[PDB]
Amino acid sequence: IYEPRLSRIAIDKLRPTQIAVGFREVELKRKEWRETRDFLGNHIVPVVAGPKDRAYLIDHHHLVLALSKEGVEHVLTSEVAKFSHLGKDEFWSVMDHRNLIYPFDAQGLRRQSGDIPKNIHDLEDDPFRSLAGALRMAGGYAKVIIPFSEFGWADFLRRRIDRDLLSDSFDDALAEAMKLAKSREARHLPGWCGVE
Amino acid sequence: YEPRLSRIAIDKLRPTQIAVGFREVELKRKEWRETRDFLGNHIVPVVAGPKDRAYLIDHHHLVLALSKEGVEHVLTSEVAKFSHLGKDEFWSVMDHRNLIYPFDAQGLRRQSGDIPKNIHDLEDDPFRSLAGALRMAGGYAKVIIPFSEFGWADFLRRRIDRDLLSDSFDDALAEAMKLAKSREARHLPGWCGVE
Amino acid sequence: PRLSRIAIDKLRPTQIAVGFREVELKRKEWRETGNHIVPVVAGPKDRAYLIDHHHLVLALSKEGVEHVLTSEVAKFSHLGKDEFWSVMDHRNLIYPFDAQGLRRQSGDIPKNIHDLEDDPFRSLAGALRMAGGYAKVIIPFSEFGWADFLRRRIDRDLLSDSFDDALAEAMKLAKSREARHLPGWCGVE
Amino acid sequence: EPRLSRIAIDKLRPTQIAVGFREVELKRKEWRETRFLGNHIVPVVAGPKDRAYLIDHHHLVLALSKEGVEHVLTSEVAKFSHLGKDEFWSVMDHRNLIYPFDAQGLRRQSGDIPKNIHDLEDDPFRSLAGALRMAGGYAKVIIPFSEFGWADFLRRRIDRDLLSDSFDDALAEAMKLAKSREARHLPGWCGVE
Numbered sequence: 001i002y003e004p005r006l007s008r009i010a011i012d013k014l015r016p017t018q019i020a021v022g023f024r025e026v027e028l029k030r031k032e033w034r035e036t037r038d039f040l041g042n043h044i045v046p047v048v049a050g051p052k053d054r055a056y057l058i059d060h061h062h063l064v065l066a067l068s069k070e071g072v073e074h075v076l077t078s079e080v081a082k083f084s085h086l087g088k089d090e091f092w093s094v095m096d097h098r099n100l101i102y103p104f105d106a107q108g109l110r111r112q113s114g115d116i117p118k119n120i121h122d123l124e125d126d127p128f129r130s131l132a133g134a135l136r137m138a139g140g141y142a143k144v145i146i147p148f149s150e151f152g153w154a155d156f157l158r159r160r161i162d163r164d165l166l167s168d169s170f171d172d173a174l175a176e177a178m179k180l181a182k183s184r185e186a187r188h189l190p191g192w193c194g195v196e
Numbered sequence: 197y198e199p200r201l202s203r204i205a206i207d208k209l210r211p212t213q214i215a216v217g218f219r220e221v222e223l224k225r226k227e228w229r230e231t232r233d234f235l236g237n238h239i240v241p242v243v244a245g246p247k248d249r250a251y252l253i254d255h256h257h258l259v260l261a262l263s264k265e266g267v268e269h270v271l272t273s274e275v276a277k278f279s280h281l282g283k284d285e286f287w288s289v290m291d292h293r294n295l296i297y298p299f300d301a302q303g304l305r306r307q308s309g310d311i312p313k314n315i316h317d318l319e320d321d322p323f324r325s326l327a328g329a330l331r332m333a334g335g336y337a338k339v340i341i342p343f344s345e346f347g348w349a350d351f352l353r354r355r356i357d358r359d360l361l362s363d364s365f366d367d368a369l370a371e372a373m374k375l376a377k378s379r380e381a382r383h384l385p386g387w388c389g390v391e
Numbered sequence: 392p393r394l395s396r397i398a399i400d401k402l403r404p405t406q407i408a409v410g411f412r413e414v415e416l417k418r419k420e421w422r423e424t425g426n427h428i429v430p431v432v433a434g435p436k437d438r439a440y441l442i443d444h445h446h447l448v449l450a451l452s453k454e455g456v457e458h459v460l461t462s463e464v465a466k467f468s469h470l471g472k473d474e475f476w477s478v479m480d481h482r483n484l485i486y487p488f489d490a491q492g493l494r495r496q497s498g499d500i501p502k503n504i505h506d507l508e509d510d511p512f513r514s515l516a517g518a519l520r521m522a523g524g525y526a527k528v529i530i531p532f533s534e535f536g537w538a539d540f541l542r543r544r545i546d547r548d549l550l551s552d553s554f555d556d557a558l559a560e561a562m563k564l565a566k567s568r569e570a571r572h573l574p575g576w577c578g579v580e
Numbered sequence: 581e582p583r584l585s586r587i588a589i590d591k592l593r594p595t596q597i598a599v600g601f602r603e604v605e606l607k608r609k610e611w612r613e614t615r616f617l618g619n620h621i622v623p624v625v626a627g628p629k630d631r632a633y634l635i636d637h638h639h640l641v642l643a644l645s646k647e648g649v650e651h652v653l654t655s656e657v658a659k660f661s662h663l664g665k666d667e668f669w670s671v672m673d674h675r676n677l678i679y680p681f682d683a684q685g686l687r688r689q690s691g692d693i694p695k696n697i698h699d700l701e702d703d704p705f706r707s708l709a710g711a712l713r714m715a716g717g718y719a720k721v722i723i724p725f726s727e728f729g730w731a732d733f734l735r736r737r738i739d740r741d742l743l744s745d746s747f748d749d750a751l752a753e754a755m756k757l758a759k760s761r762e763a764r765h766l767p768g769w770c771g772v773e
Contacts, residue, residue, distance in 0.1 A: 001227045002258035006201070006271055008235050029197070039234055041200035044273060063197045076201055078239055078273075083572050090543060093492075094572060097536050099483070110496070139759065139772040142719045152481045159474060182716065188467055188478060193770040194716040278765055285736060288685070289765060292729045294676070303670075332580040334566065337526035339575075347674045354667055377523065383660055383671065386528075388577040391521040393620045394584070394653055425583045428621070428655055447581050460584055462621055462655070 004078045006044070011068045011075055014057045014120060015050065017095065018102040019111060021061045021123050022130025022154075024170070029066030043067070044076040048100065049084045051091050058100055061123060062133075068120050099147045108155050127166050128154035134174055140181035141191030149190050156180075156189060201239070202272045206263045209242070209270070210251040211312050212290065213297035216260060217325030217349075219365075224261035238262070239271035243295060244279045246286050252315075253295055257328075260315050294342050303350050322361050323349035329369055335376035337386035344385045351375070351384060392462055394428070399452045399459050402431065402504055403440045405479065406486035407495060409449060409507050410514030410538075412554070417450040427451065428460040432484065433468045434475055442484050445507060446517075452504050483531050492539050511550050512538035518558055524565040526575035533574045540564070540573060584621065586651040589641060589697055592624070593633045595672075596679035597693060599642055599700045600707025600731075602747070607643040620644075621653040625677060626661050628668045635677055638700060639710075645697050676724045685732045704743045705731035711751055717758035718768035726767045730758075733766055 043063060047055045055077060057064060067075060083091055092113040095101045103111045106124035117123060132154035135141065141153060157177050166173040180186055182194040241253040250272060252259055262270060276295075278286050287308040290296045298306045301319035312318060327348035330336065336348065352372055361368040375381050377389040429448055432440040439461065441448060451459060467475055476497035479485045487495050490510040501507060516537035520527065525537065541561055550557040564570055566578040623635040634641060635657065644652060660668055669690040672678045680688050683701040694700065709730040712718065718730060734754055742750045757763060759771040 001231060002224050002238070002255060002261070004239055006235055006237050006239050039201060041202050044199050044201050044239075060197050081572070085569065086572070090539075093539055094536070097532070097539070098530075112494075137773045139770055142721070142768050142770045144719075144721060146722075148481065152478075155474075155477055155481070185469065188465070188470070191719055191768075191770075193719040193768070196714050196716075276765070280762065281765070285733070288732055289729070291687075292725070292732070293723075305673075334577050334579045337528070337575045337577045339526065339528060343674065347671070350667075350670055350674070354664070380662060383658070383663070386526050386575075386577075388526045388575075389523045392622075393618060394616070395618055425585065428582050428584050444581060 004080055007077050007079065008074055009047070009055055009077050010073055011064060011120060012073075013055070014047070014064065014075075014077075015054050016061065016117050016120055016123060017056050017058060017100060018061055019104060019116060019124055020106045020126035020129060021065060022127060022133055023125040024127070024130035025062045025133045026065050026069065029063055030070055033066060033070055039076065042076055044078055046080045047077040048081045048095070049079055051084060051086060051088050053084065055079070056095070056100075057120070061120070065120055065123055102148055102151065104151065108158055126154065127163070128158040128161075131157055131161070131166060131170075131173055131177055134170075135177045135181060136191070138174065138178060140178050141186075141189065141193050144190040146190045152189055153181075153191075156186060199273050199275065202242075202274065203269050204242070204250050204272055205269055206259060206267070206315055208250065209259060209315060210245065210249050211256060211315060211318065212243075212251050212253060212295055213256055213318075214299060214306060214311055215301045215319040215321035215324060216256050217322060217328055218320040219322075219325035220257050220328040221261050221264065224258055225265055228261060228265055234271065237271050239273055241275050242272040243290075244274055244277040246279060246281060246283055248279070250274075251290075251295070256315070256318065260318055263315050297343055297346065299346065303346075303353055321346075321349060322358070323353040323356075326352050326356070326361060326365075326368055326372055329365075330372045330376055331386075333369065333373060334388075335373045336381075336384065336388045339386040341385045348384060348386075351381060392464060395461055395463065396458055397431075397439050397461060398457055399448060399504060401439065402448065402459075402461075403434070403438055404445060404501050404504060404507060405432075405440055405442060405484060406445055407489045407500060407508050408510035408513060409445045410511065410517045410534075411509035412511070412514035413517040414446045414450045414453070417447050418454055421450060421454060426460050428462055430464045431461040432479075433463050433466045435468060435470060435472055437468070439463075440479075440484075441504075445504075449504050449507055486532050486535060488535065492535075492542055510535075510538060511547070512542040512545075515541055515545075515550060515554070515557055515561055518554075519561045519565060520575075522558065522562065523577075524562060525570075525573065525577050528575040530574040536574055540570060544569075582655050582657060584653055584655060586653055587624075587632055588651055589645050589649065591632070592641065592652075592654075592697060593627065593631055594638060594694050594697060594700060595634050595677060596638055597681060597688065597701050598683045598703035598706060599639045600704065600710050601702040602704070602707035603639045603710040604642045604646070607640055608647060611643060611647060616653060619653055621655050623657050624654040625658045625672075626656050628661055628663055628665050630661070632656070633672075633677075634697075638697070641697050642700050679725050679728065681728070685735050703731060704740065705735040708734055708738075708743060708750060708754055711747075712754045712758060713768070715751060715755060716770075717755050718763075718766065718770050721767040723767045729766060730768075733757075733763060737762075 045060045046058045050056045105111050106126040132150045161173055161176050186192050240255045242250045243253050245251045298311050301321040327345045356371050429444050430442045432442055434440050487497050487500055489495050490508045516534045545560050570576050622637050625633045627633045680690050682688050683703045709727040738753055763769050
């Protein structure tokens with residue numbers, strides 16, 4: 001019986017696997033959606049079965065918060081791994097070990113597993129996460145297969161662009177980021193894309 | 197942020213490989229037959245190709261099983277879009293990315309042109325069946341390398357008489373096993389013996 | 392990539408613990424018997440960071456080897472300390488866990504090779520692989536994944552007192568559906 | 581746990597058919613003033629017989645060869661010496677350590693891989709692709725033979741004449757291309773989304 005299957009869960013029941021997202025990206029998703037008119041072809045979101053019966057969301061937090069904020073109750077899911085034989089301790093370890101969690105808060109601090117929110121509606125806003133998204137969307141770096149590429153870019157920017165620039169003027173913060181992305185200083189980042 | 201759910205008729209799915217192991221197909225059939233919306237149904241990865249064509253990217257054993265059991269459609273998920281490309285380039289892109297596997301039932305390389313266009317035209321590669329069976333018996337580990345099993349099928353086809361495989365499969369499996377465990381097979385993915 | 396050289400006592404580790412039994416075994420090879428090359432990452436200062444082979448490099452150190460060839464596989468020396476560890480972590484090139492599998496912070500990663508803490512479950516998982524327990528694999532820190540699984544299921548005391556006994560137990564857990572979720576699992580499906 | 585050795589570069593067996601000569605000419609001029617305690621180590625597979633197969637860096641070794649460097653350090657990173665020859669190529673292909681495409685992008689049998697660096701064919705588009713990445717039109721990436729996939733995309737869209745008779749027009753047309761929607765599917769793509 002050869003693999004993943006469609007299922008269906010209440011968004012209020014998904015367990016997050018990261019502490020933060022960029023609310024700006026969330027809000028853009030919510031516009032797109034607010035402005036589009038069976039089950040074919042809604043979003044499917046990948047998930048892992050954890051302890052008790054719980055499903056842990058593995059990607060697409062922005063989209064899931066967007067949908068949740070739009071009043072959408074359910075989302076299609078596909079279980080891509082089954083760890084429900086583990087206790088909770090072991091589970092988080094295995095997840096951590098397999099790079100399926102990202103316990104970093106809105107100001108980029110490593111935090112413990114227990115600090116990972118239990119409901120989606122508790123994600124924190126990481127404004128550098130939004131900046132790093134927009135940067136990519138602008139052509140500042142490439143998508144790469146590395147997990148949490150964006151969060152790497154967000155940490156780079158956060159040490160280099162003033163938060164006050166970012167709330168004052170997003171596009172000027174973006175313009176800065178764009179000057180930095182291209183500099184030799186960002187050379188060590190995944191997806192880096194400039195003159196050698 | 198992106199993936200959506202879709203459907204095709206299986207007769208419209210375009211394969212990306214030439215052979216499968218028919219024993220493994222029959223086991224998947226036997227199962228399906230024996231399990232109890234659209235919730236519960238199988239979903240398979242697919243790349244958008246030239247004209248409007250969906251190309252199945254993994255799970256050929258399952259797709260053929262399902263097709264041989266009469267099942268008319270399957271749930272899919274576009275995971276890449278190359279409809280902007282023309283035929284030649286698409287095919288080349290496909291290989292550059294190892295989304296294709298054009299080796300025939302006797303393990304020989306062929307040209308994109310030789311890839312079947314229905315699931316129903318897949319050849320039987322019996323050493324691919326032996327490799328699956330060897331994995332399930334715990335002769336080596338699953339591993340994320342694409343085509344791990346076919347790499348094993350090749351090892352075995354250089355070493356185990358084809359005939360033995362029809363005469364006694366369990367004998368072919370025991371042979372496979374004693375090779376899986378030895379240093380001869382150490383270069384293979386998922387290798388699992390004494391160091 | 393091109394080739395260089397440091398004193399071993401100058402190499403910066405990137406993990407807290409290694410399996411001391413495995414280290415002792417590696418000695419006995421090198422001892423009972425084409426120099427060794429080892430990948431390193433250039434960080435803050437000219438400074439060299441060892442990205443693998445801690446067991447082997449420590450074994451060399453304990454045998455009195457002064458130096459070791461090395462191959463620099465990445466510069467990060469334009470970064471401060473902090474950004475550096477952050478990057479290392481994101482790149483998964485650090486394993487900041489101690490002898491009991493406990494997450495410690497990047498600053499608690501030791502500065503010298505002989506400051507490596509001993510984890511016996513790393514040693515047991517080591518041995519389990521060599522015995523056909525599970526498959527070498529591309530996943531990073533794979534043996535530590537196995538050491539965590541064992542450490543929750545085999546008495547530390549049994550491990551310290553009788554290694555064969557622990558390994559027989561580990562063998563039996565390795566082939567069982569409880570281990571199915573681990574990298575390299577090799578059991579009857 | 582790898583170890584070092586050297587080989588005569590004649591004795592090293594290649595693993596692809598083509599390199600970009602413009603890229604080899606470059607590595608030669610750069611190399612030219614610098615100035616074994618810090619030489620180059622290059623990754624190699626131990627093959628059937630005692631033969632050693634170059635795993636990357638053909639552009640570089642060709643450059644050495646052509647400045648009369650005789651040996652090179654090497655790190656044996658895989659051992660396939662227990663295999664027959666036929667098996668050996670097949671495992672090579674399976675692990676994507678060979679690139680049997682000639683200077684035209686055309687797929688050739690593994691028999692047609694040259695047995696000496698000095699027979700590497702010139703793929704002008706490979707050189708374009710190298711200069712393109714260097715201009716920052718796309719990005720390095722963990723994927724196997726990326727530059728080549730970009731050679732193959734440019735080879736389809738910019739006639740050969742512009743390459744031989746004017747490198748930079750060529751570089752420039754390449755750049756407008758690497759930023760467009762048209763290249764979205766390439767690894768490293770970096771244009772506006």
